[PDB]
Design a protein around this ligand. Sequence first.
Ligand SMILES: [Ca+2]
Ligand SMILES: [Ca+2]
Ligand SMILES: [Ca+2]
Ligand SMILES: [Ca+2]
Ligand SMILES: [Ca+2]
Ligand SMILES: [Ca+2]
Lengths: 269, 269, 268, 269, 268, 269
Amino acid sequence: MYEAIGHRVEDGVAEITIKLPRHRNALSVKAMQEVTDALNRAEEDDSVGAVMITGAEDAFCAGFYLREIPLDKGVAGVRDHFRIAALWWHQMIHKIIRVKRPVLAAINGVAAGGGLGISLASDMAICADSAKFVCAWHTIGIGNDTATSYSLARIVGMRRAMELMLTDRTLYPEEAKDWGLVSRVYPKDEFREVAWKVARELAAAPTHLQVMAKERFHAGWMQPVEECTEFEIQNVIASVTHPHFMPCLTRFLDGHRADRPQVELPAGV
Amino acid sequence: MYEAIGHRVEDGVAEITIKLPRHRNALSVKAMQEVTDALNRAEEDDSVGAVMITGAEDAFCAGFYLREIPLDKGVAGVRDHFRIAALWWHQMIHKIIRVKRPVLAAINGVAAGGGLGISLASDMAICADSAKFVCAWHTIGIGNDTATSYSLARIVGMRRAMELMLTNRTLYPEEAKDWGLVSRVYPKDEFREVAWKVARELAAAPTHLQVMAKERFHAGWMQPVEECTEFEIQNVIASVTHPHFMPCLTRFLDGHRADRPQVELPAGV
Amino acid sequence: MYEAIGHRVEDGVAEITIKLPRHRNALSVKAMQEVTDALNRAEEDDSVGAVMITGAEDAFCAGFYLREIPLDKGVAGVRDHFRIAALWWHQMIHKIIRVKRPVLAAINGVAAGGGLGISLASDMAICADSAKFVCAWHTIGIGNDTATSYSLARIVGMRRAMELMLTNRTLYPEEAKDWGLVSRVYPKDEFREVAWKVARELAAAPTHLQVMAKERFHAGWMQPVEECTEFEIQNVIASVTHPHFMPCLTRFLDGHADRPQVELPAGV
Amino acid sequence: MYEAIGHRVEDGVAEITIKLPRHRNALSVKAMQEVTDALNRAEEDDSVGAVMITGAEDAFCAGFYLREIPLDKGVAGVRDHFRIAALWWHQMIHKIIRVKRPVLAAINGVAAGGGLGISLASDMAICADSAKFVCAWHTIGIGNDTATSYSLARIVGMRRAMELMLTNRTLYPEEAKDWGLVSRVYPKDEFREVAWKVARELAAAPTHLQVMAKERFHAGWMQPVEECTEFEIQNVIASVTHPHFMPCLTRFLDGHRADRPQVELPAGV
Amino acid sequence: MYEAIGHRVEDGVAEITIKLPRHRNALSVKAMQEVTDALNRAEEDDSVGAVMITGAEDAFCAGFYLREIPLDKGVAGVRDHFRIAALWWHQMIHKIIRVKRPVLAAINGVAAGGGLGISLASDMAICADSAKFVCAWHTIGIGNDTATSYSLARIVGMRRAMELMLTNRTLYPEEAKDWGLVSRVYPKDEFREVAWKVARELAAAPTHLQVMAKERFHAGWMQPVEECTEFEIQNVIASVTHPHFMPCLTRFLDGHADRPQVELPAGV
Amino acid sequence: MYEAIGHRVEDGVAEITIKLPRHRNALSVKAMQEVTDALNRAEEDDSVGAVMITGAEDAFCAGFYLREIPLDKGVAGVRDHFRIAALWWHQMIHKIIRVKRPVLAAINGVAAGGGLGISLASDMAICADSAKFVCAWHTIGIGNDTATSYSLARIVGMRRAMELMLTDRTLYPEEAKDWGLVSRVYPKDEFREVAWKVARELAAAPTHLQVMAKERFHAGWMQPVEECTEFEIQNVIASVTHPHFMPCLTRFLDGHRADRPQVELPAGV
Ligand SMILES: [Ca+2]
Ligand SMILES: [Ca+2]
Ligand SMILES: [Ca+2]
Ligand SMILES: [Ca+2]
Ligand SMILES: [Ca+2]
Ligand SMILES: [Ca+2]
C-alpha cells in the first residue's frame, strides 16, 4: 500500500518506518501524509493495540526533507513549499499526540529537527546507544517547530529545553536518559529486538486504560486539580463498568499477583 | 475521637497515620473522610504548624480499599461504591493540596495507586529505604485518578509520568529520589525519628510564608509571569506588614545571615 | 553612564554587572532601574546580539537591598519602600523574560532571594564552582517573589521548587546542575573567561531565531499543542522569508547542521 | 423513592422538582444529594433524553436552606454546617454542568442565591412572567458561590454580573431576557405546559449531538481556536459514523432542509 | 485564477466570494482550499488592506457541501471524506481568525452550519435585511464545528450560544443585531454597495494598528490583565516608533481624534 | 496633598477626580501616579468603603496626555516618553482591577482612549446623558492599550469590542447602556448627585463580601467550574465565620426584610 514509508501491522503493533535512508530518513511531504494516514488507520483497527515509530537502517529521522525545497522559484517558491510541508508536519505531530493508541518512538539512530519533534511527541521513547539528538533548526536558519515549544519543556524543564535549542548541541544517549528524553538505552545490536518486544507488550496491555492516561496527561498539565479529578473520575467510572474490570479485581482478591510489569523495559545500558 | 485513622498533635505537628496494616494500609471510605476532617482541623489549629501523613507499621498506603467493594449487587453495586469512594478520595486529595499548612508525606513503605497519589499531592516527601512506589491502576483494571493527571508530571515531567503509568513497574527509592519524587531516603530504622524531626522544623518555620509559597506554586504553574508577580507582590506587602518581619530584618542587620536553614534535611542514603 | 551598575558592550554582548560588592551585590532600587534600562537599550541596539548578567567580584547577587529599608518611618515606611522596590524588581524580572535578546546569567557566586530570581529568569545559566543558591525569603521573613512562583518549578519541577523554598536550603553547584538550575559548572578561576566566550557565541548566533525560540518556550508551557504549532509555523514562514535563510540552505545543500552554535565547555 | 424532591420520568424527560414550598423551595442538604443522584441516574437512563429542573408551586428555589443552620453550637456549629452544605451544593451544581444530558431550567418563580446558581448552571432557561432573580448572598451576609463566579459572567458579561451581585437588586423577567439570563418568558398560567413541551422536544432531539455541543461550549470558552477545532473534529468524525447520520443525509438529499427546528420556542411575552 | 471561488482585488480590498449559487453557496473542499490561499495572498500583498468575504447571489454560505459526500464507499467512505473536509474547513476558519488583515463578513443572505462559522470567525460582520442564520448541525445529524465552540459564546455569551445550537432556531437580522452577531443590517438592495464602502474604509485604515487590535482581542479573552497589558505595551511602543505615528500626532497637535475611521451606516 | 488630581475621603468614599479640564482631563504621568497612590491609600483606609473615579467639569478623561510627548528629541524621545507613561498607565489600570475596594466610574463627560480604559477597568459604571465613549487609538496612530484587550470583550463580547476599536466610532449613552458598558444613564444636571449617593451606598455595603465577589469575577472568567467553586467555598466559610454573619441570619429568621437593594441605582434615562 504505502509508497513512501515502511508499514506493517503485526502482533497488535502498527509499525511505521520512516524510510529514506540515503538522506538520513528525512521526511518528505508524501511520507508525512502517509504517517498521518497510518495513525488514523491504527486507531480505527481493533487488532492494533499500539503504534511503533522507527527509522530504517541506522538513522531515526533527520527532519525536514531539505531537498524538496524549490530553488528554481524565488522566495515565494520556498515559502509556498514550507507552507505545505508545515501543514503536514503538524498534522502528523498533532496526530501522534492525539491518536487513541500508545505510540512508542524507537529511536534507532539520529533524530534531528522534526525527527526530534517526533520523538518528543510520542508517548514512550527508547533509543540505541548509537542514537543522537539535535535541534538543528538554528543551524539551517529556520524557526523551531514540530511542537518543540510544547513538548520539550514538558519533558526536560524549561532551562534544558532552552539550552538545547540555543546551543544546537548534540545530545547523546546517556545525557538524554538523564534528562528524561528517553527512558532506556540499549546496545545498537539488540535494539530492534528490544524495541519490538516493548511495542508488543504495550499493544497487549489494555488500550482503554492507556488512552485514558495519555489524554489525561496532556490535558492535566494545564488544568487545576479540581478540574483534573473530575475528568479522572469520569474515567474511573467508565473503567469499573467495562468488562475488563471484574476479572482483575477477582484475581487480586483470589491471590493472583503479576510476576512482571504490564510493559517491561529492560535495564539496558 | 477518629475511628479509622491514627491522629495526634504534638510539637506543632498534626500527624495523620493511615492505619489498616493488615491490609497494607489501603484507605477505606470512612478513613478518607477522617483524613479530610483532620486536615480541616489542622488548618484551624493555631498550635499546628505542619501536617505529616504516614502509614502504620511498614506500609505507607496500598491505595483503594478493594475489599470494601460490593460483590453481591452487580455492576451497579460496583459503580455505586466507586462513585462514593471517588468523591471522598478526591475531596481528600484536593484538601491535601489546598490546606493552609505545609504537608509532609513520610513514606515509610509501599505507596500504591491512591497511596502514590497522596505522596504526590503532599508538599514535601521523604521515604524509608524500604519504601516503593507503583501506579497499580492498570493492574487492577481501573482508569488512573487521585490527581495523578495533575501531580505526577508536575513533579517528574511528562515522559516519566507516562512511563510509570504505562509500564506499571515498581519505582525504588534511589530512582524516586533521582526523579524528584522524594527529596531524601533514610534507613528504615532511623526513618520515623528523622521524619518527626523534619516535621517539627517545618511546623516551627513561618506558616504564613509557607502558605504563600504553597498557593503560589500551585497557581503559578499555569500563570504567565506578570500575573504571578502581582500575586507574589501582594504576599510581599502582606509579609512585611506582619509582625514577623521586623525582628528578622533586625537580626539580619545585626549580622545574622538569611542563609540560615528553616528545615534541616539530613543527607540520608 | 550608569551610576549603580556596571555596563560593557563588547563583541555584540551587552554585559550587565550587578555591582555593590560591599553588600554582596544586593540590588538597590536605583540599580534595578538601570538594569531594566540596560535591557531596553540592548534590544534596541542592532549591534547587540546577547546580554550577559553577572555580579561584581565574587558574588552574584544577594537579593533585596535590605540596607535601603527605611527604619525611621514606622511600619508604613517599611511598606512604602517595599511597594516601590517590588515595582522595580518585577519590572526588571519581567524584562529579562520578555526582552528580545538571549540573556545569559553568569553566576559568579552566591545568588540569594531576588538574585536566585534573576538567575531563574534568564534564558541560560552557568555558574562558577564557588557559586551557591539559596531562597532566603523564609529566613529574612518576606513572602517569595521575583517570579519564583513562575520560573522555579518550570525549571526544576514542583517538588524541588517547593523543597528549596520551604527548607531554605543552600544549593551547591553539583546539585544545581543535576536539578537543571544551571547547565554547566566551571572553575572559579576559568569562569569569567568561559562565560565571555559563551556570551560571544550567543551574540553571534542568529538573534531572530533565538527570540522565536525564547518567546515560544515561555508561551508554549501553558498552551495546547495545536495553538503552539500555529505560532511555531508563523515563525517558520517568517524565517524562510528572511535573508538569513537561503545561504544556510544553499550551504547545507552545498556540503557544509549538527554543528554547535554555542559551545558550552564541559566544565566540572 | 426520593424523599425530599419530586421526580418523574416521562416522555423522555427526567423532571426534578425542588420541593419545599412552605419555605419557598429553599434546598436542604438532603434534597441537594437527591438532585445529584437524580442527575446521575438520568445520564444512565437510555429512556431519558433531557432533564428539567423546576420548583413546586410558585417559587423556583430560594437558595440556601437557612432554617437548617444550627444555632445552639456556636460558630463552630455554623461553620460545620456550611462545610457540609457547601460540599453538596457544589457537587450538584457541578453535576448540572457536567451531566451528559441537556438540562432545562424551568423557572416558575423566584430564584434567589443558590436558586439563581441552579438557573445559571443549566443549559437552557425559560421562566414565567411571575419569576424573579436575585443574588441575595450579601443580604444574608455570605460570600457568593454556587458557581456564580463561573456562570454569571459567561452568560451576561462581567459588568452586568458585577452589577447584579453588588446591588443585590431584583431582576425581573423582561430584563432577564434582555440580559440573556432566560431565553423566553411565558405567562404564568401557560408556563408549565409550555415548559413540558419544550423539554419533550429537547429530549427527542439527538442527545449525542447535544452532549457534544454542551461539553464543547463549556470547554471552548477557555481554549484557543486550534485546540477547540481539534475537539470539534473528533466529534464530527464520531457523529458521521454514528447510525443517526446517514438517514439525515438521505433526507436532506431528498429535499428536507436542515433549517428544520429541533426545538420550538414559542414567542411567549 | 481560482476555479471554485470568486476573487476581486480592488481599492485595497481583496474580495472573496463564496460561489456555488446553485447549491446555496455550500463550500466545497476545493473552494475551501482557495479561500485559504486567497487569505494568505491578501496578507502577503502590501496593496491589500482588508479582506471581504461574501457569497454569490442571494446566499451567504449553506455550510458543508453535502453533495460531495461519497455514497458508494460505505461508512468508511463517508468518514474519510469528512476527515479531508474537516481538515480544510478548519485550516480556513483558523486563517480567518489568524490572518494579518481585517476580515469583513458581508452576509448577503442565509448562513448555515459552516457558513455561520465563517460569519463568527470574521473580525466584523454586517448583513442584508434578507439574511438569516441557523446552526443546522443538529438537524443534518453532524457534531458542531467550524470553531463554533470557540467563537459563538465569545460573541453572544454562553446561554444564547447554547440555545441557538440546541434548538436549531433560525435567527433573523433584528435578533442577530441585538445579540451582537452582526453590527448593522441593511436593505437587500443597498447591501453590496454599503458593504463595499465599509470594506474600502477598513482597507484604508492603518493595517498595523488593526492587526495589533485583532491579535490582542483573541489572545486577551483568555489572559489575566497584567499579561494583556505587557502585550498591549509592546504594541504601543512599536506603534510610536512607526512612521505613521508622528504625522498623526503632529496633526492632532496642529488642530486636526474622535473622527470615524470606518463609517458604518445606521442601516435598519 | 495631591497636586495633579482632585481627591477627598468623605462618607466612606475615596473620590478621585481627574483634573485637567482645559485639556479635556487627559491624564498626565504625574496624575496617574497619584491615582495609583490614592487607590493604595483607599485600600489601606479602614474608613474607606469604596472608590469613585470621576472627571472634573464636563469631561471624564480624554486619555493619554498628548501634550507631554517630547517633539524636541526625535523618535527615541517619543519612545522614551511612552515607555514611561505606559508604565504608569498600566500600574494604574491594574490597580483599579486589583484594589480591595469596589470602584465606581462616574462618567460625567467624554471618555477617550485611556479614559475609556479607565471606565472599563472599574467595577461599576454609570454615566451622564452628555457623556460619550471613543477608542481614539486608531486615529492618533497608537496601538490600543490600557487593558482594552482584557476588559472590553469581557463586558461587550468580542464582536462589539472589535467593532468599536476598528471603526473608532463614538458610542453614545443609550447604546453604551444597551451594550452593558454602563449600567445606567442620568440627566447631566443630576448626575453628580446621583453618582455621589451610589458611591456612598457602595461604601456602606460590606466591603468584605464585595471584594470576594470582585476578585472571584475576574479570576473565574478564566477558570473551570470545579476550580471556581473551591475559591468560592473558601469565601463562604470565611464569610460565615465573620462577625457580620450571624446578625444577618437572625434578622432574616426574625422576619426582617430589606425594603431596598444594597446599592440602589435609580432608573435614570
Ligand atoms: Ca494496548
Ligand atoms: Ca509552619
Ligand atoms: Ca544573537
Ligand atoms: Ca435529547
Ligand atoms: Ca487596513
Ligand atoms: Ca463597602
